[PDB]
């Protein structure tokens, strides 16, 4: 059954994405002398992993790799209600296993926060929600525009375009809220490390941005 | 009406470009603890954002996202005079709102200059005009060459080719003049911050570079 193969693809795609991306953000300098946080390091690993994962699993499950976009397809009637509940559950499970494996292989002296997204100390959580609302908006709009069958002028790798959309989101909002733009990516390490601070902005934020982006494209720009 | 949708797309696309790209230029160490400036951070965020915006809005409004290229199409009779004035006004408006949002979500101690393009202290504005004239010339020439219908050897993503043209412009002239190569990108934060020093070189510069690039391609190289 392709339905079970699609769900297992989403679980496995998220598992690789979380494990590889959260590993790159590990600060090997430790707490006694933290090394400067390489910034293009985190952006490319998060960005290119999505491009790699969409290339790998795009034809098997659609390559949502995000609870935010999965909701957008339901809002735009691209997948069924029963379709999304298995995707969201599989995506959340993949992050939990993906981050759980990383905790086992990472030496305790360099684990730190395990890539858990934190809002800046001087930044209000209200502004943190707005940042997530926008960085996910450009991501979902790119995904919808790149995967439009009615278009003709689409050139190049669709997965690469989606990957670079994630990278610029990280190139902007790592110090604001961690540039989550993925509720599953924030749910995983939060479960493992037991850190649950301002976690609602990482679900309400991307979902509102996803629904706004999907509705604008499907019902206003290209109806 | 497709006219209203095209102008709205330009306002929205240009707004996202400012907020994401100017945010990457924020020095989170502040004036009192300046962190070293990451050049690939600024270059890639600016370069890939244009490549993302062209992918998102290329089929809706043409994906100018620049007052300089809009003049170039007029100089080559590719868009109407009435079309350009609404494009330029929307692009100027998008940067003003886009920079205003960034000023709202940035902590006061790290706002700094808000990405406003100053000329280097040891560099004369006369030489600064020449730098802006050239890095915009290579941008407009790439856009005209990438989007030429008569060509048959164009391969890969057109948006990515335009995106990397912007990136190399930033990799060259960030400490020369800030590598504006976009009159709207300089007008937006300047309005918000009220900094108006050598601002004419950021309008006269890119526009003259665009006119030379558009005229040379359309009337000399590939007539």
């Amino acid at each position, epitope marked *: 059954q392709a339905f079970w193969k699609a769900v297992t693809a989403e679980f496995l795609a998220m598992l690789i994405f979380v494990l590889l991306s959260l590993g790159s953000t590990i600060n090997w300098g430790g707490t006694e002398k933290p090394l400067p946080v390489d910034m293009v390091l985190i952006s490319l690993c998060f960005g290119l992993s999505i491009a790699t994962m969409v290339q790998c699993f795009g034809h098997i499950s659609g390559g949502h790799i995000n609870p935010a976009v999965t909701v957008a397809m339901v809002c735009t009637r691209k997948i069924s209600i029963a379709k999304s509940v298995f995707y969201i559950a599989a995506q959340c499970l993949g992050a939990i296993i993906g981050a759980g494996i990383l905790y086992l292989v990472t030496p305790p002296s360099v684990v730190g926060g395990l890539g858990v997204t934190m809002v800046h*100390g*001087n*930044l*209000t959580a209200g502004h943190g929600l707005l940042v997530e609302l926008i960085i996910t908006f450009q991501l979902v709009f790119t995904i919808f525009a790149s995967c439009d069958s009615k278009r003709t002028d689409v050139t190049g790798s669709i997965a690469l375009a989606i990957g670079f959309s994630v990278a610029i989101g990280h190139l902007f909002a790592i110090n604001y809220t961690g540039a989550s733009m993925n509720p599953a990516r924030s749910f995983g390490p939060a479960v493992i490390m037991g850190n649950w601070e301002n976690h609602w902005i990482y679900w309400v934020g991307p979902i509102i941005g996803a629904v706004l982006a999907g509705g604008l494209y499907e019902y206003v720009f290209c109806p | 009406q497709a006219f209203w949708k095209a102008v709205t797309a330009e306002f929205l696309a240009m707004l996202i470009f400012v907020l994401l790209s100017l945010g990457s230029t924020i020095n989170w160490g502040g004036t009192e*603890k300046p962190l070293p400036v990451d050049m690939v951070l600024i270059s890639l965020c600016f370069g890939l954002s244009i490549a993302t915006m062209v992918q998102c809005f290329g089929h809706i409004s043409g994906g100018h996202i620049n007052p300089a290229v809009t003049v170039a199409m007029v100089c080559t009779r590719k868009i109407s005079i009435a079309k350009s004035v609404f494009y330029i006004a929307a692009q100027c408006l998008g940067a003003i709102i886009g920079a205003g949002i960034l000023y709202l979500v940035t902590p006061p*101690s790290v706002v700094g200059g808000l990405g406003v393009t100053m000329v280097h202290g040891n560099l004369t504005a006369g030489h600064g005009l020449l730098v802006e004239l050239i890095i915009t010339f290579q941008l407009v020439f790439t856009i005209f060459a990438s989007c030429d219908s008569k060509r048959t050897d164009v391969t890969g993503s057109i948006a990515l080719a335009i995106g990397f043209s912007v990136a190399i412009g930033h990799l060259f002239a960030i400490n020369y003049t800030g590598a504006s190569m976009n009159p709207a990108r300089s007008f937006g934060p300047a309005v918000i911050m009220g900094n108006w020093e050598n601002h004419w070189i950021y309008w006269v510069g890119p526009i003259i570079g665009a006119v030379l690039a558009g005229g040379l391609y359309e009337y000399v190289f590939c007539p």
Partner: antibody
Amino acid sequence: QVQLVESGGGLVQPGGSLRLSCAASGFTFRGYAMNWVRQAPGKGLEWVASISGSGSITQYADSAKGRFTITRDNSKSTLYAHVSSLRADDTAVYYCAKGDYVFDYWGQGTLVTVSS
Amino acid sequence: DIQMTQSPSALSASVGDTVTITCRASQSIRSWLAWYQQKPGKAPKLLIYKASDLQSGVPSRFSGSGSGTDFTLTISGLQPDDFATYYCQHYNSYPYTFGQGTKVEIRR
């Protein structure tokens, strides 16, 4: 136009508890980190505690750990410092100062005397 | 922690003289240093941040230098207002620590 006003000082029995306030106005209180600095009579300055703009991150000096708790309320733009288990050494003049790294704006100072 | 020691403890000078005080850090803190001026019964006033930058509103006669562990604050032309107590502050890493304080006194 930026000023900080302190309150809550004065005499206090040893081993008690105290609440120090620092009312702030003229600047965006939410977006700036707040600090507590004391100066014992005849001695130098001693940094005590730090709090982020949203209160998410708080740090304390080695001698200020446990006994002192710093919290801020951005609704009324007031900074509080819970001083518990006061000792005879803990007497000093306390200043509230803003600044993540370097303090530029200081209050007038509140004198706390711990004496039976 | 990082212990910051000042030298001399107290120095004497006349109006118009040039004096320098030194702040010594236990470990390297590069250009993360701050200087303050405090008069009796008054809050400290910030003079220098980044160990070489002058805070706005401060006269240019104050000059700071040094990096790593050796820092020197120098006053070019002494003034009657300049007689106060000067502290060196560390902000490379938490906890932030001040110096032991150096007092400037009139010479007679």
